[PDB]
Amino acid sequence: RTLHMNLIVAVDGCGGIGRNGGMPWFLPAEMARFAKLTTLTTDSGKKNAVIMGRKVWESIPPKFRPLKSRFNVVLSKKMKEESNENVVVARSFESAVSLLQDMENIETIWNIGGREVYELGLNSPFLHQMYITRVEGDFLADVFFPRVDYGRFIKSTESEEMHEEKGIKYRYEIYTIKTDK
Template structure:
């Protein structure tokens, strides 16, 4: 079993803020949220029978409106210290999440569930989980939605991707982002609810 590469997906303010008091600091970015849903759901063309996995921390799980939980058509893996030491060996029912005690256990579970069939593995936060994922050797890519706005935040993304350069990371072109995600991305950026933003893809160099 090969450990799958990890893609972090995040939306952040100009100063890399991602959260405030347990929720996202902004409102009304519906198309941005739909982008998140499509990108995390879409499977590479060769593996139409499998689902992608989304890995998240327990606080992020709690922040998702109950009617959207678990995120549909994706294997939802929630990291919580109160998870059983031994994760279930059978797949969860379609309407349930899997709870595991660590990022390492989440990766193992995702790998078993889908790596052989090529499903993607996304890390969707929050800050503590992004931090652990970024330290992991299989962290390969960040899909950043860079908001051209500032909101009061008490949580930041633990990697500074403001500007065009980041040590050890390479910002990919719009064409490369389109090819990887399968999205058609408008040139010149997005705007919604009075907020300009840009979809970006960063890849680790080494």
């Protein structure tokens, strides 16, 4: 019935997310939380889906492709079809979402992005929550998170401490779309 689409992203002080096709940092504890948030489901036997762009797919080491215990959906007009049954190449955002709402064993769609994928999620009726990791500093990024109006959301007020790995500081933020709260 209810099918949420959540956004999860780590942005720096200028909203940057990507550099030279990869991520501008490596935060193992932050990424373990990413893996847990995008994998764990309320209903066991049900799965979560991750929707991503081709460049996010190419940024994952092939030994970790596809992302374990999740149904992978890759948006691309150029990619050949993936024979792996846990991966589907979707030619459009609308067809990807329609396919995911068709499969009943999917509990939550996690938009793991690429700027355009995040942008389409921000305009989706299924938009539910944004899980933003705000990293301190300017990491000289060449790809940025979409310009989002935070006034559309309610910021969750749970206590959020500062984190640090490898001399990199960051804090967690959670937002809920205002029509859902």
